[model samples]
Structure formats: structure tokens, C-alpha cells
Target: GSSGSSGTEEHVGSGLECPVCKEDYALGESVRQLPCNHLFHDSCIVPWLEQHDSCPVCRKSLTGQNTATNPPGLTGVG
Candidate 1:
């Protein structure tokens, strides 16, 4: 005997919560995953960027364009 159902089970897992506000994120809510791969609710981090562009945990700059030191220019020569 064979079944004809073609649906997959949803994996309901918890995402990273906001450290400052301590609020959980919903399934459809937008989020920002830092370069560290740590996730946070958009509302929690957006306001933070306005003040200073650094990861709350690692001190990595969010606005990569605002770095004080200019990165080495890569001249792609064929």
C-alpha cells in the first residue's frame, strides 16, 4: 500500500531573541543576521544602527561603508 500525500512537515524552531528588549521573533517577521550568523529582530537592530554601526555582541561595524581605514583597492586586470 502507498500513500499519496505530498506535504512536508514544518520545522518550528526558535530564533535568536533581542538582547536589549528581550522579544521573540515571529515566523514572518523580518530579521537581520549578522556576519557572525547571529539573528535579531529588525526592529531591535535598526534603531541601534542609527546610533552606532557596530554589532552589539562583537563590535563589528554594520555600515561597512563607514570604515575609517580605506580597504586596499582590488584592480581586476585581465
Candidate 2:
């Protein structure tokens, strides 16, 4: 048994794997979201933005100083 594929130009959902690092996401930490709606580990894509201004997969270019407001201030969650 197997499955098939189709075509649909829509939003790209954040998968369990990071296309760049090829690793699974965490169970506690949140991943990063790009303008292309592509998702990646925070540690992977942050620097990628400086060197490459396009998404690795789609290559969709964007221009904006995306307000990086997520501060490292998490206190506790348990």
C-alpha cells in the first residue's frame, strides 16, 4: 500500500523536520517562521537570513526588518 501526490499552491506547513539541518523539531522549544511560511529551527534560520535573503526551498525573496521581538525571558512553564 502507498499514497500519491497532487498540486496545490497554498501555505507551507511547518513539518517535524528542518529542511536545512534535516533534524526533527523539539517538543518544548518553538520553531521560527519565515515570510514564505516556511519553518525552521531558531538556531538554523537566524543566521541564514544574514547570508541569504531567500528561503532555501522556495527561494522566495523578501525585504523587511522583521521585528525580532521574542526575548529570552521565559521564566517557567511547569
Using TM-score as the measure, the top candidate is 2
Q: Please give the lDDT score for candidate 2.
A: 0.64
Q: Where does model 2 exceed 4 Å of error?
A: 1-14, 64-78
For candidate 2, give the lDDT of residue 60.
Answer: 79
Clashing pairs in 2: none
Model 2 TM-score (2 dp): 0.55
Total clashing pairs in model 1: 0
lDDT per residue (tens digit) for residues 1-78 in model 1: 996864543323443566647776677877777776566668777666545545777767555454564322333411
Using all chains and alpha carbons, the TM-scores for the candidates as numbered come to 0.54, 0.55
C-alpha RMSD of each candidate structure in angstroms: 11.1, 8.6
